[PDB]
Amino acid sequence: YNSTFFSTFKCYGVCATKLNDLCFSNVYADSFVVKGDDVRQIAPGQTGVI
Amino acid sequence: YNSTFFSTFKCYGVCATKLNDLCFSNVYADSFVVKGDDVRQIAPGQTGVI
Ligand SMILES: CCCCC/C=C\C/C=C\CCCCCCCC(=O)O
Ligand SMILES: CCCCC/C=C\C/C=C\CCCCCCCC(=O)O
Ligand SMILES: *[C@@H]1O[C@H](CO)[C@@H](O)[C@H](O)[C@H]1NC(C)=O
Ligand SMILES: *[C@@H]1O[C@H](CO)[C@@H](O)[C@H](O)[C@H]1NC(C)=O
Numbered sequence: 640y641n642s643t644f645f646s647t648f649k650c651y652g653v654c655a656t657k658l659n660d661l662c663f664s665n666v667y668a669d670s671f672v673v674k675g676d677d678v679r680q681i682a683p684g685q686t687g688v689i
Numbered sequence: 690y691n692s693t694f695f696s697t698f699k700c701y702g703v704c705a706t707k708l709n710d711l712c713f714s715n716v717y718a719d720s721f722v723v724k725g726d727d728v729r730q731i732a733p734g735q736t737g738v739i
Contacts, residue, residue, distance in 0.1 A: 676694050686705040687698070688690045 647678055697728060 653661070673681075673689060680689045703711070723731075723739060730737040 676696055679698075684704050684706055686708065 649682075651683065699732075701733065 648655075650658075677687070677689045679685075680687045698705075700708075727737070727739050729735070730739045
């Protein structure tokens, strides 16, 4: 909360206000770099080049 | 996919992933120019000058 600030943060299947009260089973992190217009394509139902 | 890139692309009444599987009846294209803050008003159920 003092260092890193996110322009997009969106959660699917779970309320964002309850992430502090849960425990998670199989956690994986995928990393990549896109341009600014292509961030809207990282979503469950989407079309486009990405 | 090599030339034109869209800042917004949103579809209503259909999932975007199925546009390659369908065939469309009465296609019309409406063209105009707005400013950056007025793009959010091209949606059903909006208020604003546009
Ligand atoms: C020029 C008129 C085309 C009429 C097509 C009619 C129905 C098909 C609907 C949508 C597909 C074409 C729209 C462009 C979508 C760009 C997708 C992308 O690149 O991210
Ligand atoms: C200080 C006045 C308080 C008014 C609140 C009273 C009722 C609320 C109903 C509508 C408020 C709309 C606020 C302006 C919206 C601008 C719409 C636009 O142009 O895109
Ligand atoms: C948060 O960042 C500032 C930046 O210098 C730092 O001084 C502060 O100690 C940090 N907070 C904590 C709890 O470490
Ligand atoms: C896409 O655009 C580039 C731009 O130089 C071009 O070289 C390439 O041939 C285009 N793709 C196709 C399939 O024509």
